[PDB]
Nucleic acid binder design. Structure first.
Lengths: 941, 398, 400
DNA sequence: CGCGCGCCGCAGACTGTCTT
DNA sequence: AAGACAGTCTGCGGCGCGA
């Protein structure tokens, strides 16, 4: 209703929080802090007010509301986990069953065929042959009661679909006559998402209310290793600090079991028949492979038993568990266009490589003609190559023929071909014939050996990375004796057996100039022989194909399961855009719910932040995640999640207002116009471009300091060392020299006759810095996150010695806060969809971006729910600190994108193909303020 | 730049010595030499493999070069000599040439018309599955105006009947498949390019060009049609025009992909020929192995031996019956030099030069020279067929 | 009679509205051929090229335009289809409204562009330039397959016939021997693919232009029809094309220069196609075309199993067969599946050598059913052996 | 946040082999 | 027995990605 600004726009008609903490009266510090330089009095034009009837809150308080929601969501799965904890499992069966399908093992190991386990809780493992990839086999599970085994395609020797419809195992009940719960089942596993990918009912478009717990995720939450910590841990099999290795371990199941259980070490098959063995040897080694999988299941069960109490006492808030359970059910819908995308990306890669390779072959073939003079002081580039030929090669009138058939020519040819025996006298009849004796030696090196399975003509081995290719086409500084294999007038390029220098970064000996030499190409100081286009074209092609070269094995090998007509929902088939001849399926991304420190989800293929680019090949991977007919992707990204979470926790540490801190002020308010934004203010102190300030600041929040700043400044502008020293002045935003130093808790720096240390109780800067809260919570008691407190891993705990991982821990604060934000969003979204019967529970999440697969009829409602979530979650953050209020600017998503495919924005993914919209696609509609005209109740406009 | 002289010396072009680029592009040239005919045959075979035989639901169709019934004036800039150009003002001793323009026949200007005429019957051929194709390679006659002439162009035309909804998707599909086909076989694929275009009626399409030394020239055109020509051809009823996209029956959109092979063969000849700092001059037509008219050149080493013809004839038969085209170079005499022979075979785009010498009676290793590399090798008479077959097949693959 | 209905229904011939009678087929005025007829003609032309051009060592391809510019066409001398404005096909003005000319002085005898009625003249026009290619060895020859336009008799219809023409330049002394050699080779080629070679025949005829000539006939059910003609033409045409300068147009035979004698071998590929179709026909209606000539070799089907996976394996087999040059009719992708007997009768009428049926047993052990057109016998065969078996069968049929 | 970690690729000891 | 030829390991350099 009313404007309600406490020095800045705040949301009114809150319907949440209240007037428990009315007024601070401590604004004397915030006004003065905003007053230094300018930064205090800006216009700050108002935002339109939003009137909305939020859904009822059960807890009578925001934190209580979220706790009640999370408890109601995770209660059946928590009690299933507790049933797993108090499990008196009988011993393993003496002999595993050969029968097809699911087999249960009772007392003394009798085998009984069962359609499905019919168990509320299971610890599950699936081992795949991988000779015919994507197909599951040799699965093994345990429940609190008995053991279960699963077999398929090893009993029968028959050609298989290769599409993997019913290849996945069946594990979810039919919802009819379920035990006691209402088919609420938890499946526990190490890398449990891999086992989820092989479940029959997990690919249905409708939810199944089966959830998955990952032992790896709980390990990384309880005792995980950062990148540097992991490297040091592997090296040891952190100067003056080596006691974190006793409480931490790597993510491998063996080391995790050693850490948490510590029994006899786990034994892995050295044959590894599932990784490199064939289907046959897996068939003959059924019992041993079945015994190893069951042992892995046992190890996972013991680890889970040792982990669940530790996880629950280190992450007490139920929101964390509910959010992890929701991340465990990620779902990517795909259609027949996925196969087309794979084929087109592979084809574009193949033809780009073929074009570059054919240019290389043409250059090599043209160079071979210099053998007449042997290139003696003829070619400045090829004068050093080897031009050797092997000792010995291979070591009248008019007449008319009547109707007379003659075989003399054929007999002569056969007799001539019979002379292969004489090659033995020439020593050529050996199994290996001489390889291209006539051609120069380097050309033989470039040419594939004859009779190869993948032989191709010409120097097909050439790939632009060899030292010969620059000798073919790369006229650089002062000619180009490319390689010296070791370390004057005016010499721009020096190769005189000394000075290993070609204007590379720092002083590096080698430089194939496959990258970062493009500005030298456009400058003209680095030109190719054929012309000024060949070298740049090769570099351009390399840029296009590098991403696909790196990621084609991952992308093309994704597990895709295609649903038949029967499995699809009735809404999809009756949609006008339903394709009877089309293929519709899904990919389960196989994410690790808590993959790294900070509990950030990890998946290299999908969760990597990489949108489609105009040049890189195969970069439309995300855009191929397309909703089925009658469905859409409703999603949004959090506006400056990391930057806002950093802005908060600094203002609250300073006072009760949001914009009290200068960094918080510029983050909350201030745009590109004027110097009110953070980037412009940073660039004002020291003259640099706004992009330079952006690159500086993103990284300045995470460590950086003087060395990184000065090195990047040298890289950009190549300034003198005096300005590098003066960058200490630019680092005054971080409050340099705050806290021998001239500033400390006591005002007087000078002291003498001190028996012990004094004025060392607390440390912190005092100049537009938020790092005080991050450093204080980095070195604190057991709970280390302000919002729904989840402790850092025991590896990074500061107990006893420090371990000198301060940068990692201060980064962990913000990043784990972001993960808590994501969990809050997920629990709120689940509650909103369940309460109001919004169809399309499924979801995807990539960093701050979160999307939901929603029925189109409900799409706008889902968008409203999303906006409501963005309110409550942000409000929840403000509630867990002393703010007790939220600004109107950050209260809502800037735009909620309703689309058919997964893209950062609607107008993207041009890429290599001319018409991405030429393929069946329609533009989405980011809503923003429009979607508020509706109401979340099913009865809509 | 002036490789047309090489086309004159080695008969890839027509009989006449004066061959301007305008005549070659327009189709008014006298014809193509035997090597040119073979290059056209190879190009048409590659087009047929890529478009027709491999692609499902695409079938051949033959359209007559002429039309035998009454037709509107068509594309005649001059209204014959009966309506627009009459002798004197009237000069009428006695009629509009005794038939006006009613009974006059017409030379086909495009292959689309015959495909549209065969649409209904060829839809009966399939079980009315709407995604359907009709391909044809044939000669098309166009008027050429000079400051009245007939230009003949060998065009490969594919008429793809598609559901209306998928028309743009199939446009992109064929734009993707035709462009890559032209890119393949090309020594400099960058010279081939594409451009999106819109028709006077707003009907969008694509146009493929090759960058000749003077500029870009059109070699192919893809056009999407809103069943306009199909309905004009068959205005009686729509029910007989219906095909099955799915469970529903709809009138197809017509996608006409029309490429030319003469200017397409002109584009590949210019691509093969190649140009700074080399200081190494060797006139060679580096044609793709799949399009090179003649693969291997057979010769005899000295000629006093006189036992080389027998084995050369046997090798000739072995290679020819296995699908390798061979130049009978063992008949010509009084050459007196092997350098000029190699230069000739290079300019003819001969992949390999096989030479049988007097050292082949024993230890039967024939000499083998390559077009790409001027390097001599020794290879047994056996497995030469296999080596050449592998070479051609692997060039096809990559 | 019934064979024409079979060929139209099975898409060997085009629409039946214009070609009810056989006379339209014998002439070129029929409305073209169906896809199967086009494939059969392509096979016949390829076999002709192999037997006449590739295997022969002195024969070269020649490019002859369909239209003859003839700004100098002779005035009303051999004036067939002489309009060629690209938009007019008047044949001959026997009666004319001669106000200024038949139609106009510029449009008659000046813009003649006579459409080609034979491929001989185009080859002769290329004789001198192609003489350089063979190093002035005069016993060489030229070959071409192309469409030729003829009158058909109120209005004058235009008949198109695809003709295969070999123009053989020979020394005059060996001209008759080469004529007999080419007669024998042409007759053996025509009889090579014939179920009944006795139908194919040869007769000897005389002419004023050429003293020696041979005409090949096929004995159709109604009577004998000409399918190829051999003429031992003199040097008259070559001298007429190049008048007065013998020194340029004479080749060398044993170091002796002589004006070549021209032999014209002209065969009708459309009438040959009809002849072979009639040869193939003979209670069971099957077109037993030669394996090398048959348009489509094998028919691939699915039955008695899961539709999707059988479709995938059939697609894989289809691609494998196409990669090796075996043309296959994709009988799969069809869902009606009326019956196996009706399917076999249909594929017999389309001259398909083998019918391949893929079933669930193919998924179990890889065995597919294979039915033969000739022996009407069914055999179980493995998937991998099918391509090699088909290649061997075609090769064995090629070489008797 | 000073920058390493996987994959990917090139190139050189070195060893073991299979002809000679 | 030795030398030509294969597979190894084992160094150095990019490339996207994360920290």
């Amino acid at each position: 209703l009313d404007i309600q600004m406490l020095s800045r726009g705040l949301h009114e008609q809150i319907f949440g929080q209240g007037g428990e903490m009315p007024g601070e009266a401590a604004v004397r510090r915030s006004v003065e802090h905003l007053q230094k330089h300018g930064l205090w009095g800006q216009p700050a034009v108002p935002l339109p007010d939003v009137e909305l009837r939020l859904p009822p809150l059960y807890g009578d308080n925001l934190d209580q509301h979220f706790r009640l929601l999370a408890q109601k969501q995770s209660l059946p799965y928590l009690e299933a986990a507790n049933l797993l904890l108090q499990a008196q499992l009988p011993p393993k069966p003496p002999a595993w069953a050969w029968a097809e399908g699911w087999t249960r093992y009772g007392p003394e190991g009798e085998a009984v065929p069962v359609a499905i386990p019919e168990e509320r809780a299971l610890v599950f493992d699936v081992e795949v042959c991988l000779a015919e990839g994507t197909c599951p086999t040799l699965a093994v599970a345990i429940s609190p009661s008995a053991w279960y085994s699963w077999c398929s395609q090893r009993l029968v020797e028959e050609r298989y679909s290769w599409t993997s419809q019913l290849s996945p195992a069946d594990l979810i009940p039919l919802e009819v006559p379920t035990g006691a719960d209402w088919q609420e089942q938890l499946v526990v596993g190490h890398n449990v998402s891999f086992d989820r990918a092989h479940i029959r009912e997990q690919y249905l478009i409708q939810g199944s209310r089966m959830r998955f717990l990952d032992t790896m995720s709980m390990h990384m939450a309880i005792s995980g290793l950062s990148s540097f910590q992991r490297s040091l841990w592997i090296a040891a099999k952190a100067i003056s600090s080596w006691d974190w290795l006793d409480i931490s371990s790597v993510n491998s199941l063996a080391e995790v079991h050693r850490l948490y259980v510590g029994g006899p070490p786990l034994e892995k098959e050295p044959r590894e028949l599932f990784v490199k063995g064939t289907m046959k040897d897996i068939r003959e080694n059924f019992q041993d492979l079945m015994q190893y999988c069951a042992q892995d299941v046992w190890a996972t069960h013991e680890v889970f038993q040792q982990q669940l109490p530790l996880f629950l006492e280190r992450c007490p808030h139920p929101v964390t568990l509910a959010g992890m359970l929701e991340m465990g059910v990620s779902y990517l819908p795909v259609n027949q266009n996925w196969e087309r995308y794979l084929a087109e990306a592979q084809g574009t890669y193949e033809e780009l490589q073929r074009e570059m390779k054919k240019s290389l072959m043409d250059l090599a073939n043209d160079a071979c003609q210099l053998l007449s003079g042997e290139r003696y002081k003829e070619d400045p580039w090829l004068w050093d190559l080897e031009w050797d030929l092997q000792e010995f090669k291979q070591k009248d009138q008019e007449d008319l023929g009547p109707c007379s058939e003659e075989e003399e020519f054929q007999q002569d040819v056969m007799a001539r071909a019979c002379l292969q025996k004489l090659k033995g006298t020439t020593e050529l009849l050996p199994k290996r014939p001489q390889h291209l004796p006539g051609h120069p030696g380097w050309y033989r090196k470039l040419c594939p050996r004859l009779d190869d399975p993948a032989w191709t003509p010409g120097p097909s081995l050439l790939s632009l990375q060899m030292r010969v290719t620059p000798k073919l086409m790369a006229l650089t500084w002062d000619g180009f004796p490319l390689h010296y294999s070791e370390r004057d007038v005016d010499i721009p390029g020096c190769w005189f057996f000394k000075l290993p220098h070609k204007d590379g970064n720092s002083c590096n000996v080698g430089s194939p100039f496959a990258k970062d030499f493009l500005p030298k190409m456009e400058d003209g100081t680095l030109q190719a022989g054929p012309g000024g286009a060949s070298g740049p074209r090769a570099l351009e092609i390399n840029k296009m194909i590098s991403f696909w070269r790196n990621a084609h094995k991952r992308i093309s090998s994704q597990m895709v399961v295609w649903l038949p007509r029967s499995a699809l929902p009735r809404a999809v088939i009756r949609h006008p855009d339903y394709d009877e001849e089309g293929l519709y399926g899904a990919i389960l991304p196989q994410v690790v719910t808590a993959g790294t420190i900070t509990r950030r989800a990890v998946e290299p293929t999908w969760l990597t932040a990489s949108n489609a680019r105009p040049d890189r090949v195969g970069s439309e991977l995300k855009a191929m995640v397309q909703a089925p007919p009658g469905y859409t992707l409703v999603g949004a990204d959090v506006d400056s999640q990391e930057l806002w979470i950093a802005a908060v926790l600094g203002d609250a540490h300073f006072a009760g207002m949001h914009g009290c801190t200068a960094f918080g002020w510029m983050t909350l308010q201030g745009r590109k116009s004027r110097g009110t934004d953070l980037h412009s203010k940073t660039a004002t102190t020291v003259g640099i471009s706004r992009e330079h300030a952006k690159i500086f600041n993103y990284g300045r929040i995470y460590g950086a300091g003087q060395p990184f700043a000065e090195r990047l400044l040298m890289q950009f502008n190549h300034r003198l060392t005096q300005q590098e020293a003066a960058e200490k002045a630019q680092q005054m935003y971080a409050a340099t020299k705050g806290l021998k130093v001239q500033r400390e808790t006591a005002r007087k720096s000078q002291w003498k006759k001190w028996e012990v240390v004094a004025e060392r109780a607390w440390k912190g800067g005092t100049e537009s810095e938020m790092f005080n809260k991050l450093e204080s919570i980095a070195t604190s008691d057991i709970p280390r996150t302000p919002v729904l407190g989840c402790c850092i891993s025991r590896a990074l705990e500061p107990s006893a010695v420090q371990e000198e991982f301060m940068t990692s821990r201060v980064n962990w604060v913000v990043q784990s806060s972001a993960v808590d934000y994501l969990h809050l969003m997920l629990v709120a979204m689940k509650w909103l969809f369940e309460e109001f019967a919004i169809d399309g529970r499924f979801c995807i999440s990539i960093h701050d971006e979160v999307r939901y697969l929603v029925r189109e009829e409900d799409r706008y409602r889902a968008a409203l729910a999303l906006q409501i979530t963005n309110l409550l979650t942000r409000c929840m953050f403000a509630y867990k600190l002393g703010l007790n209020d939220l600004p109107q600017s950050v209260a809502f998503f800037s735009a909620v994108d309703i689309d058919r495919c997964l893209r950062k924005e609607v107008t993207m993914d041009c890429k290599t193909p001319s018409n991405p919209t030429g393929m069946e696609r329609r533009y989405g509609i980011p809503q923003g303020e429009a979607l508020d005209i509706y109401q979340i109740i099913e009865l809509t406009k | 730049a002036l490789l047309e002289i090489c086309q004159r010396r080695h008969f890839l072009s027509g009989s006449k010595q004066q061959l301007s680029r305008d005549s070659l592009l327009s189709g008014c040239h006298p014809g193509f030499g035997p090597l040119g005919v073979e290059l056209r045959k190879n190009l048409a075979a590659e087009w047929w493999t890529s478009v027709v035989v491999f692609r499902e639901q695409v079938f051949p169709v033959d359209a007559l070069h002429h039309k035998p019934g009454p037709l509107l004036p068509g594309d005649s800039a001059f209204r014959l000599v009966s309506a627009e150009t009459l002798r004197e003002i009237l000069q009428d001793k006695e009629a509009f040439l005794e038939n006006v323009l009613k009974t006059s026949g017409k030379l086909r200007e495009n292959l689309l018309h015959g495909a549209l005429e065969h649409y209904v019957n060829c839809l009966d051929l399939v079980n009315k599955r709407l995604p359907y194709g009709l391909a044809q390679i044939g000669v098309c006659f166009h008027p050429v105006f000079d400051t009245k002439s007939i230009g003949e162009k060998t065009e490969a035309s594919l008429v793809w009947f598609t559901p209306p909804r998928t028309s743009n998707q199939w446009l992109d599909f064929w734009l993707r498949h035709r462009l890559q086909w032209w890119r393949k076989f090309a020594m400099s694929p960058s010279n081939f390019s594409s451009s999106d275009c819109q028709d006077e009626e707003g009907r969008k399409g694509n146009k493929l060009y090759y960058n000749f030394p003077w500029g870009k020239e059109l070699i192919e055109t893809l056009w999407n049609l809103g069943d306009h020509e199909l309905l004009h051809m068959y205005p009686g009823n729509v029910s007989k025009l219906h095909g099955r996209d799915g469970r529903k029956n709809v009138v197809p959109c017509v996608l006409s992909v029309n490429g030319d092979l003469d200017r397409g063969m002109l584009a590949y000849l210019y691509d093969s020929f190649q140009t700074r700092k080399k200081n190494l001059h060797r006139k060679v037509l580096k044609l793709h192995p799949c399009l090179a008219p003649i693969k291997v050149a057979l010769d005899v080493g000295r000629g006093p031996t006189l036992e080389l013809r027998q084995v050369c004839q046997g090798l000739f038969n072995e290679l020819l019956e296995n699908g390798i085209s061979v130049w009978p170079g063992y008949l010509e005499t009084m050459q007196s030099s092997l350098e000029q022979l190699y230069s000739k075979y290079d300019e003819m785009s001969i992949l390999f030069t096989v030479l049988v010498t007097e050292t082949t009676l024993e230890n039967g290793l024939i000499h083998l020279r390559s077009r790409d590399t001027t390097m001599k090798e020794m290879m047994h008479i056996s497995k030469l067929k296999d080596f050449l077959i592998k070479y051609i097949s692997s060039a096809k693959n990559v």
